[PDB]
Amino acid sequence: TLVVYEEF
Amino acid sequence: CSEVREIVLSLNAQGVYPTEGRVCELMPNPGCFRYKQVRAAFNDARREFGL
Amino acid sequence: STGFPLELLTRPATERLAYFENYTVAHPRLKEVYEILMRTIAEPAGASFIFVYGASGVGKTTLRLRVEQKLTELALPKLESDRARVPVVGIEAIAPESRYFNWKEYYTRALITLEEPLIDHKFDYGVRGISRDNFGKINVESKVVAPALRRALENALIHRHPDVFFVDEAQHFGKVASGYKLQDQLDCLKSLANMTGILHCLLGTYELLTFRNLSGQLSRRSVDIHFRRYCADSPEDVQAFKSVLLTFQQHLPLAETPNLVDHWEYFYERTLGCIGTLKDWLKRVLSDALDREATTITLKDLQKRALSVAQCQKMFKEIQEGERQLSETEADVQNLRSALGLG
Amino acid sequence: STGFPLELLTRPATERLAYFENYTVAHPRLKEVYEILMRTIAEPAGASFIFVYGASGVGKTTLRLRVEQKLTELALPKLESDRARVPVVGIEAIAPESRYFNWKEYYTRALITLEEPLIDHKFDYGVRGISRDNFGKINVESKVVAPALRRALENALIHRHPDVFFVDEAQHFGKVASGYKLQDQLDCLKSLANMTGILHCLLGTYELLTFRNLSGQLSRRSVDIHFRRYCADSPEDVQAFKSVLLTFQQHLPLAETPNLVDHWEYFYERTLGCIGTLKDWLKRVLSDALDREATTITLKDLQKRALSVAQCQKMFKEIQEGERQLSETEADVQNLRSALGLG
Ligand SMILES: Nc1ncnc2c1ncn2[C@@H]1O[C@H](COP(=O)(O)OP(=O)(O)OP(=O)(O)O)[C@@H](O)[C@H]1O
Numbered sequence: 001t002l003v004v005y006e007e008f
Numbered sequence: 009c010s011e012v013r014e015i016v017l018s019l020n021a022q023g024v025y026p027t028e029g030r031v032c033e034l035m036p037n038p039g040c041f042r043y044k045q046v047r048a049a050f051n052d053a054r055r056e057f058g059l
Numbered sequence: 060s061t062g063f064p065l066e067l068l069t070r071p072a073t074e075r076l077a078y079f080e081n082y083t084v085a086h087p088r089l090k091e092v093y094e095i096l097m098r099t100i101a102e103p104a105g106a107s108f109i110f111v112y113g114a115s116g117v118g119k120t121t122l123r124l125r126v127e128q129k130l131t132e133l134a135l136p137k138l139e140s141d142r143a144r145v146p147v148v149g150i151e152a153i154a155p156e157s158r159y160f161n162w163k164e165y166y167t168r169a170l171i172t173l174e175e176p177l178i179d180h181k182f183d184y185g186v187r188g189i190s191r192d193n194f195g196k197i198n199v200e201s202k203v204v205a206p207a208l209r210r211a212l213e214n215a216l217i218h219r220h221p222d223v224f225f226v227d228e229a230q231h232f233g234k235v236a237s238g239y240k241l242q243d244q245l246d247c248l249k250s251l252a253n254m255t256g257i258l259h260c261l262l263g264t265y266e267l268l269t270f271r272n273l274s275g276q277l278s279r280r281s282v283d284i285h286f287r288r289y290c291a292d293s294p295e296d297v298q299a300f301k302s303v304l305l306t307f308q309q310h311l312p313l314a315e316t317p318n319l320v321d322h323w324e325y326f327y328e329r330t331l332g333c334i335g336t337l338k339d340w341l342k343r344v345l346s347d348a349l350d351r352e353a354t355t356i357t358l359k360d361l362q363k364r365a366l367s368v369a370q371c372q373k374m375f376k377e378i379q380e381g382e383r384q385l386s387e388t389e390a391d392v393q394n395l396r397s398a399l400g401l402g
Numbered sequence: 403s404t405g406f407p408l409e410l411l412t413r414p415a416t417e418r419l420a421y422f423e424n425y426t427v428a429h430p431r432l433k434e435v436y437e438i439l440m441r442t443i444a445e446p447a448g449a450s451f452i453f454v455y456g457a458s459g460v461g462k463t464t465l466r467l468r469v470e471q472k473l474t475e476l477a478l479p480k481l482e483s484d485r486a487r488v489p490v491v492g493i494e495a496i497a498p499e500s501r502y503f504n505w506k507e508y509y510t511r512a513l514i515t516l517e518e519p520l521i522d523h524k525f526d527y528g529v530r531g532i533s534r535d536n537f538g539k540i541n542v543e544s545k546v547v548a549p550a551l552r553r554a555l556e557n558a559l560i561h562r563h564p565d566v567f568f569v570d571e572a573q574h575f576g577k578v579a580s581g582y583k584l585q586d587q588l589d590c591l592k593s594l595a596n597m598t599g600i601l602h603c604l605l606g607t608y609e610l611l612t613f614r615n616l617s618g619q620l621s622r623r624s625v626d627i628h629f630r631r632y633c634a635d636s637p638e639d640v641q642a643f644k645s646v647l648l649t650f651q652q653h654l655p656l657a658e659t660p661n662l663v664d665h666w667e668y669f670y671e672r673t674l675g676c677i678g679t680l681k682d683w684l685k686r687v688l689s690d691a692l693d694r695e696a697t698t699i700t701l702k703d704l705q706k707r708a709l710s711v712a713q714c715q716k717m718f719k720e721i722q723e724g725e726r727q728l729s730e731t732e733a734d735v736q737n738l739r740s741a742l743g744l745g
């Protein structure tokens with residue numbers, strides 16, 4: 001499963 | 009002599025070192041210091057404020 | 060959603076490029092580093108230095124920018140009432156054009172960047188030759204020798220009390236002559252920081268590792284942080300690289316999203332796991348695509364804008380010589396225990 | 403009771419953080435060193451300098467603060483009959499930016515800190531170029547030649563006649579050019595102490611040990627005072643470390659009691675027995691816990707804000723060198739006896 005990060 | 013006194017006072021108030029040349033440069037007749045009392049007054053003011 | 064808004068599909072190339080450039084991602088490495096730096100900033104507890112080591116292009120400067128931005132909202136509500144205070148200040152060291160470092164220029168630049176809050180505020184530095192002209196630019200005479208500038212900077216730093224003094228590109232402090240020692244330069248910096256009571260955060264490449272553990276004082280006096288890259292030798296770093304590639308792919312303002320997950324290997328070849336290098340490569344290739352008017356991204360445009368072989372060779376050599384000195388092993392812990400006698 | 407007051411539980415976190423910050427424990431080594439330093443300051447018996455060695459974070463600066471406030475408090479009741487005298491002056495030297503240690507800047511800093519309180523009067527050092535200002539701070543011109551500044555400081559020190567000249571971070575006196583023996587550097591202050599009658603108490607780390615015995619004339623008027631950590635070889639020092647750990651833990655503003663007593667070894671290796679390091683580490687952990695509202699302090703919360711093993715090894719090497727330098731055995735007494743001829 002590939003995770004999706006948020007904006008810093 | 010008074011005018012020299014306020015000149016050195018204001019010059020030190022702004023922050024510059026009040027020297028003979030700087031005081032002369034902002035006084036209309038910068039040759040009066042040949043008088044044996046005007047230079048004495050300037051030196052006395054400098055000593056009073058600590059030079 | 061999880062990517063760029065669809066409205067950006069009707070704009071010019073400049074808007075897409077600006078949106079992508081003003082887009083910063085939060086990988087777990089950056090998240091942990093940001094959290095511990097924020098916690099250290101909150102309460103240094105007698106720490107004079109926070110050295111920030113990391114590979115060139117890992118994200119040091121963006122982390123510093125976000126830190127100052129955060130410091131500016133943790134202060135603004137408390138800056139509505141209080142005044143004569145700045146949240147955070149920064150400066151970048153000047154590489155000297157002579158054989159030796161110019162400390163006088165450092166002091167002058169620090170005084171220039173520190174003291175410009177508002178024309179209304181006035182304060183006497185006690186040094187003859189420092190004033191503010193009619194244009195509101197702090198001017199320093201050419202004859203003010205280094206100790207006088209140091210005293211003026213000390214007074215200004217005490218008056219202003221920033222939460223931290225950021226010194227980026229700190230390795231330039233090492234440009235010294237034969238007899239000059241690095242401990243002397245770091246001791247001058249430590250004396251400044253301790254006398255003004257302002258925490259100093261030095262950021263730079265692994266060359267700044269020459270300023271680490273010099274003396275016992277400079278040593279205790281220090282919280283060393285490390286902005287490590289992602290390494291292919293661990294599954295977690297590889298997976299995080301793939302995930303950041305996926306989120307970049309979904310945040311590339313194009314009608315068709317390119318598949319950058321499968322091309323991670325070559326990616327890691329030219330980026331060394333550094334997210335900043337990856338971002339600059341991606342933004343370059345996006346500018347290329349939007350100039351050529353290409354809907355998606357292909358490998359040829361990736362190879363037309365990647366770094367050279369020798370550049371990556373030297374980068375990885377420096378990175379290896381850096382990480383070799385910033386690793387903790389149980390053998391060192393037991394060695395210290397035995398030397399102290401705790402074992 | 404013997405711990406933190408319960409009413410601090412409803413207080414804001416800033417109050418608890420500050421309260422632990424200014425909280426002090428009179429651990430036995432600090433007590434003994436304060437006693438000997440006070441007794442040596444009270445009368446100098448011709449002594450020109452007192453060397454107070456120690457590691458980084460031992461508590462030299464807290465020592466100086468306590469001693470200075472004490473001398474001020476004793477001098478306050480008697481400062482009405484005899485004015486024109488300062489009880490104690492406290493300075494810390496500047497690490498030079500040039501190769502040479504700037505003597506003129508040392509003299510300038512000393513005269514300001516000496517004469518900078520009220521306008522009780524004046525002294526008129528009789529040296530031109532030195533004065534105060536409308537803001538009340540003494541300002542001297544860059545044209546005042548260093549012998550003139552020395553004479554002005556001489557007259558000011560003979561008037562003020564302070565009990566002691568505090569000089570923290572005195573190891574910075576060693577930063578001298580090549581071919582210039584540290585002897586003459588110490589004799590520069592020796593002449594000042596001899597023709598002003600003021601004893602100069604120099605603190606600092608073990609790097610000051612290069613100033614110990616240069617000439618017999620220097621060593622005769624000197625008092626050696628050594629701040630030492632808690633060595634792990636004897637169990638009395640281990641019990642002292644345990645007891646101060648209890649004292650520190652007892653006044654931690656925590657809802658539940660963090661049993662830090664069990665892991666005394668981990669505290670020891672990350673602190674090296676220098677109580678300042680433990681104070682800073684516990685303060686960092688307290689700040690993090692108050693941010694996270696933690697009911698107790700656990701092991702991970704202790705190991706995030708702990709010193710790196712490399713810094714610990716470097717400072718420990720410095721400590722071992724210093725303890726080797728400041729070691730006296732009966733054998734040395736026997737050698738002195740045999741050399742004199744008393745045998
Ligand atoms: N997490 C990130 N998300 C998006 N862009 C990033 C991120 N980190 C870095 N960048 C981008 O990478 C580029 C260069 O990185 P950065 O300025 O942070 O360099 P640095 O790590 O401080 O390195 P150097 O020591 O070489 O100056 C910038 O365009 C910056 O916006």
Ligand SMILES: Nc1ncnc2c1ncn2[C@@H]1O[C@H](COP(=O)(O)OP(=O)(O)OP(=O)(O)O)[C@@H](O)[C@H]1O
Pocket residue numbers: 105276425426427428429432456457458459460461462463464465606607677678679681682
């Ligand atoms: N008895 C004590 N109780 C509590 N905290 C203490 C005590 N002694 C020292 N400390 C802590 O140690 C910290 C650092 O100690 P101090 O500044 O005296 O070190 P130093 O040995 O003079 O350092 P340096 O060698 O780096 O100049 C203080 O800020 C204080 O928090």
Ligand SMILES: [Mg+2]
Pocket residue numbers: 120227228
């Ligand atoms: Mg940079």
Ligand SMILES: [Mg+2]
Pocket residue numbers: 462463570571
């Ligand atoms: Mg100190």
